[PDB]
Amino acid sequence: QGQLVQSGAELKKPGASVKISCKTSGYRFNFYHINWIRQTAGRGPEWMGWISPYSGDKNLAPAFQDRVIMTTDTEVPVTSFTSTGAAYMEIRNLKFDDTGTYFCAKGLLRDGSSTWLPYLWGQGTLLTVSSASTKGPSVFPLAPSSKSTSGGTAALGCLVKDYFPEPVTVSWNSGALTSGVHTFPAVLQSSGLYSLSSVVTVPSSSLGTQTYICNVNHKPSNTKVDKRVEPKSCDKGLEVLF
């Protein structure tokens, strides 16, 4: 196995360039090809190229031959079976149709005739190419609402409103609360701004004894918002229980 950890989401203007990084660990960096693959709305999945960390040998798809630069750093030995490394992909002359998710991926050596075949993938980097400026979200509480009175359960959450670009990440109580959490994909408003919601289902009795805080991160604007969801509800079914 190991780990391929990619750099964060980026917003770029048309005409600009961007350099995405892919940091590796848990295996011997030098001995596996690193691939770059993207997914865009317009073209679907698209393999861009690979590079050999050991030799610097490169293979680029014709569509990217004159606009993509692949590089690697030198491997930092750790153990016989593992090392750390880094690969980079720089893409130039960006346009709106380059918006999408970019992946690095390590090749499968067991594929003897094509040892580069992408097998172990990074988490992806979201690139948005747009003329619009970054906007951080406004976070509002979603006040507790009855789910089941007889069951003694309620749902509460946070509305993450009007941000750009994607993505936003949401956790609850600094990651301590993971059960019963539902974070929804964002909606893309006519304004060109995104909104999403995250909700957690909890015992209604816990509204008086447990603090619920959504931790919202929008790294593109370098903003965090920690909102305590005020537990006093306007829901009639829930109101009766308090």
């Binding site: 861009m48 094509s114 509305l159 909606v187």
Partner: protein, 214 residues
Amino acid sequence: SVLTQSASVSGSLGQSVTISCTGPNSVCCSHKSISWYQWPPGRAPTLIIYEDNERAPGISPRFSGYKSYWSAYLTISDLRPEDETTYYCCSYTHNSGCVFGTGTKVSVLGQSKANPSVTLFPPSSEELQANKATLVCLISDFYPGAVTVAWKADSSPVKAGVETTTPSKQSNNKYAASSYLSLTPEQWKSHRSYSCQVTHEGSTVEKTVAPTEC
């Protein structure tokens, strides 16, 4: 893409389905290797098959590959709910990177209908101070993965500032969606109530909120 897949295919729980992947000689099949990836929307893919018929490490023997002179095939046997997603083949050689196929959505039939869990939230006091109003209708745990949403102001349709997401697959292999109704604080306070109506397989659930006690 010149590498064509069946756009959609279906099979029932516990049964099998086969997906095809073919195209001109430059991509299939003699002297061309074929791999298969499971690629759920919004996630990283998983390699299933490489070199036509070899399972990737740890892949269930439910998955098998075969490449004839004419076409490559992925067969998924003993179908499970988690198999309902998108699959891509890729044509490749020693010196030539992946050409990805056009993609296939697999539907897994014979699963139980699951009714949506719906929660409607009113605007926060914080937002009304700002000064806006957003109703949020959250929809989860429904199967099959389709719903339609309608909003109501008291008893009559609303149409302005409604925005609804596509459905997305949850980790439990049911689906989720959300809908947002934007209002001015005056609209919000000028009605007795607002409702979000979620229709799933002909059946409509209604959730309602009111400004009166907020």
